Amino acid sequence: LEEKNRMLQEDPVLFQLYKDLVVSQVISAEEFWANRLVGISAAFLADVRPQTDGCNGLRYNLTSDIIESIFRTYPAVKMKYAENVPHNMTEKEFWTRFFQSHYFHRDKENSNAAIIKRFNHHSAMVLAAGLRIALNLKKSDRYYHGPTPIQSLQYATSQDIINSFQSIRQEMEAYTPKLTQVLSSSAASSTITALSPGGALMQGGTQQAINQMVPNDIQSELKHLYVAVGELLRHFWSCFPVNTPFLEEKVVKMKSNLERFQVTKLCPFQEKIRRQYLSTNLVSHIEEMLQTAYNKLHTWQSRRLMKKT
Amino acid sequence: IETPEQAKTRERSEKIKLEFETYLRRAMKRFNKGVH
């Protein structure tokens, strides 16, 4: 319970969603939670040093990560901690002793041999703890005419077309540039009218500010409803296609949850719009999606019934 | 591990205090034996 509660607190929207789905008896908490569900470096000793502050401050910063690394590399330190802390000595006293002991301050043949042995032992402990088809298509013409549907490609008449080809060939064989014939005042006025605002070319015009027509609180509620419906429908479609009998029961439960959500949350929200008489059909998209899901489920049920005939 | 100069100063102060205490003790012993 404690683990479950902390998850809701971190995401207030999910907690609000959890309240709207479970407290309102739309879905059970069990079904709600059913769908919801370091290397070791050798620098941990050399880089980690007793930090000296401005005025006699031993800033140990004894993070548990360094302590765990020391325990992994040096089991003797862990044994001493277990056999001394917190009865024989305190943790800080043990750390001070370790700093003051020869174990940390390793710094002449005997001394060199001891240093070499310590380094080899550290390396060995670190190493030990580190483990603990040719394609040949057939019909390439499909790429020549791809997803483009069959167009209106029409072949002309018989040889007479060539004669027409001759006509233009004879028409533009003796050609002279013209200036007045290019444009006329009436044609210019017609073009301006077409290009004038409100004309045929100027399609439509200004629109309405839908942002101010829908209150921001209603917008947030619509967003929350959209998120909830989308998650429920994603869970519904995840089962599809239904290949096992358990998926049938799961989809039936999902449909029941969708109906409960629509009754408990969507309908009072609808009146919330209807009481305000907003002309925006925000609920229309939700209704379309819900009806599409219901029709898909009914069609699949009909297919299942027919397969058993 | 922290301010080695401060630790050395503390050790020197302790040594000076011990030397002064030993000097006082030996002076007292000298006075007592002279009185005896």
From Swiss-Prot, chain A:
It is found in: Nucleus. The keyword Transmembrane helix does not apply. (Microbial infection) Upon Rift valley fever virus infection, interacts with NSs leading to ubiquitination by the NSs-FBXO3 E3 ligase and proteasome-dependent degradation. One of its GO terms (cellular component) is transcription factor TFIIH core complex. Residues 1-37, 54-106 form the BSD domain. Keywords: Acetylation, DNA damage, DNA repair, Host-virus interaction, Nucleus, Phosphoprotein, Repeat, Transcription, Transcription regulation, Ubl conjugation. Component of the general transcription and DNA repair factor IIH (TFIIH) core complex, which is involved in general and transcription-coupled nucleotide excision repair (NER) of damaged DNA and, when complexed to CAK, in RNA transcription by RNA polymerase II. In NER, TFIIH acts by opening DNA around the lesion to allow the excision of the damaged oligonucleotide and its replacement by a new DNA fragment. In transcription, TFIIH has an essential role in transcription initiation. Component of the 7-subunit TFIIH core complex composed of XPB/ERCC3, XPD/ERCC2, GTF2H1, GTF2H2, GTF2H3, GTF2H4 and GTF2H5, which is active in NER. The core complex associates with the 3-subunit CDK-activating kinase (CAK) module composed of CCNH/cyclin H, CDK7 and MNAT1 to form the 10-subunit holoenzyme (holo-TFIIH) active in transcription. Interacts with PUF60. (Microbial infection) Interacts with Rift valley fever virus NSs (via OmegaXaV motif); the interaction leads to TFIIH complex proteasomal degradation. This is General transcription factor IIH subunit 1. It comes from Homo sapiens. The lineage of its organism: Eukaryota, Metazoa, Chordata, Craniata, Vertebrata. The chain holds residues 111 to 548 of 548 of the full protein.
